[PDB]
Scaffold this active site. Structure first.
Site, short mmCIF file in Angstrom:
data_model
loop_
_atom_site.label_atom_id
_atom_site.label_comp_id
_atom_site.label_asym_id
_atom_site.label_seq_id
_atom_site.Cartn_x
_atom_site.Cartn_y
_atom_site.Cartn_z
CE1 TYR A 1 0.16 7.96 2.85
CE2 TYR A 1 0.69 5.75 2.10
CZ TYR A 1 -0.21 6.64 2.65
OH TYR A 1 -1.47 6.19 3.01
CE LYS B 1 -3.84 4.45 0.23
NZ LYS B 1 -2.38 4.51 0.60
CG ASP C 1 -1.87 1.27 1.13
OD1 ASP C 1 -2.88 1.27 0.38
OD2 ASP C 1 -1.55 2.26 1.82
N1 LIG Z 1 -6.08 5.84 3.10
C1 LIG Z 1 -5.63 6.71 4.00
O1 LIG Z 1 -6.14 7.78 4.37
C2 LIG Z 1 -4.64 6.04 5.00
C3 LIG Z 1 -4.41 6.66 6.25
C4 LIG Z 1 -3.54 6.11 7.23
C5 LIG Z 1 -2.85 4.89 6.96
N2 LIG Z 1 -3.09 4.30 5.67
C6 LIG Z 1 -2.26 3.13 5.19
O2 LIG Z 1 -2.35 2.10 6.22
C7 LIG Z 1 -1.00 1.76 6.70
C8 LIG Z 1 -1.11 1.26 8.15
O3 LIG Z 1 -1.55 2.42 8.96
P1 LIG Z 1 -0.50 3.28 9.84
O4 LIG Z 1 0.82 3.41 9.13
O5 LIG Z 1 -1.26 4.54 10.11
O6 LIG Z 1 -0.34 2.55 11.23
P2 LIG Z 1 -0.32 1.04 11.83
O7 LIG Z 1 0.03 0.06 10.77
O8 LIG Z 1 -1.56 0.93 12.63
O9 LIG Z 1 0.89 1.18 12.87
C9 LIG Z 1 2.20 1.46 12.42
C10 LIG Z 1 3.07 1.63 13.69
O10 LIG Z 1 3.12 0.39 14.35
C11 LIG Z 1 4.42 -0.06 14.58
N3 LIG Z 1 4.47 -1.50 14.44
C12 LIG Z 1 4.32 -2.34 13.35
N4 LIG Z 1 4.37 -3.62 13.66
C13 LIG Z 1 4.56 -3.62 15.02
C14 LIG Z 1 4.69 -4.74 15.89
N5 LIG Z 1 4.64 -6.01 15.53
N6 LIG Z 1 4.89 -4.41 17.25
C15 LIG Z 1 4.93 -3.09 17.68
N7 LIG Z 1 4.82 -2.00 16.83
C16 LIG Z 1 4.62 -2.32 15.48
C17 LIG Z 1 5.25 0.60 13.51
O11 LIG Z 1 6.63 0.80 13.92
P3 LIG Z 1 7.90 0.57 12.93
O12 LIG Z 1 7.42 0.99 11.58
O13 LIG Z 1 8.92 1.56 13.51
O14 LIG Z 1 8.29 -0.92 13.07
C18 LIG Z 1 4.55 1.96 13.36
O15 LIG Z 1 4.97 2.89 14.35
C19 LIG Z 1 -0.18 3.05 6.40
O16 LIG Z 1 1.22 2.86 6.45
C20 LIG Z 1 -0.79 3.39 5.01
O17 LIG Z 1 -0.23 2.47 4.06
C21 LIG Z 1 -3.96 4.84 4.69
O1 LIG Z 2 -4.55 17.85 8.15
C1 LIG Z 2 -4.66 17.41 9.40
O2 LIG Z 2 -5.62 17.75 10.09
C2 LIG Z 2 -3.60 16.50 9.93
O3 LIG Z 2 -2.54 16.28 9.00
C3 LIG Z 2 -2.77 15.15 8.30
O4 LIG Z 2 -3.80 14.51 8.45
C4 LIG Z 2 -1.75 14.68 7.30
C5 LIG Z 2 -0.71 15.56 6.92
C6 LIG Z 2 0.26 15.16 5.99
C7 LIG Z 2 1.27 16.05 5.63
C8 LIG Z 2 2.25 15.63 4.71
C9 LIG Z 2 2.21 14.35 4.15
C10 LIG Z 2 1.19 13.46 4.51
C11 LIG Z 2 0.23 13.88 5.43
C12 LIG Z 2 -0.80 13.03 5.82
C13 LIG Z 2 -1.78 13.40 6.73
S1 LIG Z 2 -2.91 12.06 6.97
O5 LIG Z 2 -2.96 11.51 8.29
O6 LIG Z 2 -4.15 12.45 6.32
N1 LIG Z 2 -2.19 11.13 6.00
C14 LIG Z 2 -2.33 9.68 5.88
C15 LIG Z 2 -2.92 9.33 4.53
O7 LIG Z 2 -3.56 10.32 3.93
O8 LIG Z 2 -2.81 8.22 4.05
C16 LIG Z 2 -1.10 11.61 5.39
O9 LIG Z 2 -0.39 11.03 4.59
#
Ligand SMILES: NC(=O)c1ccc[n+]([C@@H]2O[C@H](COP(=O)([O-])OP(=O)(O)OC[C@H]3O[C@@H](n4cnc5c(N)ncnc54)[C@H](OP(=O)(O)O)[C@@H]3O)[C@@H](O)[C@H]2O)c1
Ligand SMILES: O=C(O)COC(=O)c1cc2ccccc2c2c1S(=O)(=O)N(CC(=O)O)C2=O
Length: 315
Positions: free
Chosen positions: A48, A77, A43
């Protein structure tokens, strides 16, 4: 099963690697390791600011003969500043060029909100509100459809759309492709039963983001709930001799969701993938669902006045 059927006849692996906040200096290794231990879904997003470095890793493993392109499920995206119909193809091609790919398996409208075009990802006024653009969901969707018809993307979908916004698309007269996926935040503190029921009943696959509660999110406060350190979920894990993260990844899998946990830590990337060797029980599932507090990691609080802000609706 490890993959779920999309409306375009393609199968999407239900466990993917997230890359939000994966630094460019560490995500190449993260992706390489992930592919080595079994991940086939990555993803991505332009916003990013690491798609080059993801693309590096993918190219190296293709060249190593570790995987074939047809085996990979790469998602990106369209960022908010590119919603204008005339900007969509270019944004998609920029991602493709960074990823060093000639197609994406899935391309999502990242948020329903369009922002003022420009170099800045979050253009703000002088009072912290976002500067919107004069774009609407349906026109942006039509431009996404063109991408499918041109062969640049195999499927299109949406993210952070509420059910009324999804319905806008579904009910669009002249619709050419239904959204294949709606990617939304989902975890035991935001269980999304109503939007999940909605989407699944419309044949839209749901992808759960921030399944571990995004502890690395940049606006984390001390008083905020922390899923990974929840003693209750820790107890469920210990009983299964798994870690809390594994439990939090398995939970959406057993709701017929796709899930995309993020890590750049090689050990965690491997651990996180080992969630096909156990089942959460009915009690487990029920207990985790009961922890819902309608708490969002991603509430886009800078855009609460935007006309398409998604989270004023109940769901
Ligand atoms: N569509 C959108 O608006 C949107 C928004 C937010 C997220 N997303 C996508 O969803 C993905 C997942 O969400 P997220 O990045 O917000 O957070 P998440 O996957 O809920 O959590 C990531 C955090 O968890 C830690 N972590 C991972 N595996 C772990 C484990 N086994 N034990 C302890 N800590 C662990 C990571 O640390 P380390 O990385 O330091 O290991 C990082 O700090 C994103 O990366 C992105 O691809 C999409
Ligand atoms: O605008 C706000 O109220 C808070 O700032 C953000 O949410 C923000 C800033 C961001 C500023 C610069 C790069 C990425 C940013 C992102 C985000 S986010 O959490 O929407 N989000 C996750 C996603 O869209 O997948 C972001 O990649």
């Amino acid at each position: 099963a490890s993959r779920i059927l999309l409306n375009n006849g393609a199968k999407m692996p239900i466990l993917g690697l997230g890359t939000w906040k994966s630094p460019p200096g560490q995500v190449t290794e993260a992706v390489k390791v992930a592919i080595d231990v079994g991940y086939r879904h990555i993803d991505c997003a332009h916003v990013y600011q690491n798609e080059n470095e993801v693309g590096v890793a993918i190219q190296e493993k293709l060249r190593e003969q570790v995987v074939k392109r047809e085996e990979l499920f790469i998602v990106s995206k369209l960022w908010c500043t590119y919603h204008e119909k005339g900007l969509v193809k270019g944004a998609c091609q920029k991602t493709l060029s960074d990823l060093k790919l000639d197609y994406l398996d899935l391309y999502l409208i990242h948020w329903p909100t369009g922002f003022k075009p420009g170099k800045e990802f979050f253009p703000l006024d002088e009072s912290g509100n976002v500067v919107p653009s004069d774009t609407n969901i349906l026109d942006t969707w039509a431009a996404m459809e063109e991408l499918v018809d041109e062969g640049l993307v195999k499927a299109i979908g949406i993210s952070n759309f509420n059910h009324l916004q999804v319905e806008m698309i579904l009910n669009k007269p002249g619709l050419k492709y239904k959204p294949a996926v709606n990617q939304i935040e989902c975890h035991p503190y935001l269980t999304q039963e109503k939007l999940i029921q909605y989407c699944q009943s419309k044949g839209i696959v749901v992808t759960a983001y921030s399944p571990l509660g995004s502890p690395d999110r940049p606006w984390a406060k001390p008083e905020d709930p922390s899923l990974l350190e929840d003693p209750r979920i820790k107890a469920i894990a210990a009983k299964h001799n798994k870690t809390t993260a594994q439990v939090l990844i398995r939970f959406p899998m057993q709701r017929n969701l796709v899930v995309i946990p993020k890590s750049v830590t090689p050990e965690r990337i491997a651990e996180n993938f080992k969630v096909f060797d156990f089942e959460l029980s009915s009690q487990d599932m029920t207990t985790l669902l009961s922890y819902n507090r309608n708490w969002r990691v991603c509430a886009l609080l800078s855009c609460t006045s935007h006309k398409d802000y998604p989270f004023h609706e109940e769901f």
